[PDB]
Amino acid sequence: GPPGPPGFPGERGPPGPPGPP
Amino acid sequence: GPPGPPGFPGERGPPGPPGPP
Amino acid sequence: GPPGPPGFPGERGPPGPPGP
């Protein structure tokens, strides 16, 4: 048969690194 | 034939950008 | 039929905290 539907999106990424001084 | 099952979940998103100065 | 393709990537992370 035909392929199933696409899976769900992943979760959100982690916070970025601290900013420069 | 019947369509297949849903796909695997997406991967986690990328890390965020650097914070402000 | 075969399983569907994997999902799309998640949301971009939040910006980082202010620098020193």
Task: List its traits.
21 residues; little secondary structure; homotrimer
Structural write-up:
- The structure is a homotrimer.
- With 21 residues, chain A is mostly loops.
- The radius of gyration of chain A is 18 Å and the shape is rod-shaped.
- The N and C termini of chain A lie far apart (58 Å).
- Chains in contact: A-B, A-C, B-C.
- Chains A and B meet through loops of A and loops of B.
- It is classed as contractile protein.
- Keywords: collagen, integrin, triplehelix, contractile protein.
Write the layout of secondary structure elements.
The structure is a homotrimer.
Chain A: no helix or strand
- Summed up, the helix count of chain A is 0
Terminal-residue CA separation of chain A:
58 Å
**Content of β-strand of chain A:** under 5%
Helix content of chain A: under 10%
- Shape category of chain A: rod-shaped
Using the CA coordinates, give the radius of gyration of chain A: 18 Å
Number of DSSP E strands of chain A: 0
SS class of chain A: little secondary structure
For the largest beta-sheet of chain A, the strand count, sense and barrel status come to:
none
Multimer state: homotrimer
The largest interface is: A-B, 21 and 21 residues
